[PDB]
Design a protein around this ligand. Structure first.
Ligand SMILES: O=C(O)CCC(=O)Nc1cc2c(Br)cccc2cn1
Ligand SMILES: [Mn+2]
Length: 222
């Protein structure tokens, strides 16, 4: 990589505090990024993903249109070792940011949500990742698509930063890491993808929000 600390202190912290959206290119390098790509493609090829989000439910069921496919990855599974390394590297970054990302104190994360857009013209509608205060404060996405050309293949992640009249368009480029605030500051969508598009997402939890979300959404026997 490039030292997690240099990346965090000189780019990720100031850019997150200023814009709420931060892009790091060439995060792990070609050899590691390619190993991750190999692992994700292996998962896909061996059937570990779901069939995909039901986008249009037709009268017939062979005609149904399915979109983003997913699998949850802990990073310790056999054949997911390098995914685990990515997750450790994301954690290292976040660790070096803590106390500096807004007023958040990050104390945990989800497992990795690995997504595959099959390349059938499906995307992902505009949404907010954490609209209801469930404790997720930062979304972290790693992209693995070598030689992606959005003009040909689509698949741009378009973010609609609150209060600004502008789009932030992020191509799902190989070895690119994206951070953005998970709440309503950053509604976003994925534009239709016409080639197979892979991404690995982790969400980091703010300790306080997560603690009260547990109060909100809920046990010991008497
Ligand atoms: O690939 C990218 O560029 C990011 C795409 C993205 O926004 N994925 C995503 C998936 C979700 C699912 Br599945 C369930 C609930 C919330 C979700 C929020 N976001
Ligand atoms: Mn999202």
């Amino acid at each position: 990589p490039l030292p997690a600390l240099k990346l965090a202190l000189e780019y990720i912290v100031p850019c997150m505090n200023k814009h709420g959206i931060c892009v790091v290119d060439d995060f792990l390098g070609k050899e590691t990024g390619q190993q991750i790509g190999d692992e994700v493609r292996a998962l896909h090829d061996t059937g570990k993903f779901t069939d995909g989000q039901l986008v249009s439910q037709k009268s017939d069921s062979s005609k149904d249109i399915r979109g983003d496919k997913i699998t949850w990855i802990e990073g310790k599974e056999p054949g997911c070792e390098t995914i685990g390394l990515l997750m450790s590297s994301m954690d290292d970054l976040i660790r070096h940011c803590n106390g500096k990302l807004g007023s958040y104190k990050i104390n945990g994360r989800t497992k990795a949500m690995v997504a595959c857009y099959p390349g059938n013209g499906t995307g992902y509608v505009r949404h907010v990742d954490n609209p209801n205060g469930d404790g997720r404060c930062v979304t972290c996405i790693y992209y693995l698509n070598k030689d992606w050309d959005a003009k040909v293949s689509g698949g741009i992640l378009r973010i609609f930063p609150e209060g600004k009249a502008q789009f932030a368009d992020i191509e799902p480029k190989f070895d690119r890491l994206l951070f953005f605030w998970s709440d309503r500051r950053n509604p976003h969508e994925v534009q239709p993808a016409y080639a197979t598009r892979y991404a690995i997402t982790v969400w980091y939890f703010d300790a306080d929000e997560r603690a009260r979300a547990k109060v909100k959404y809920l046990r010991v026997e008497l």
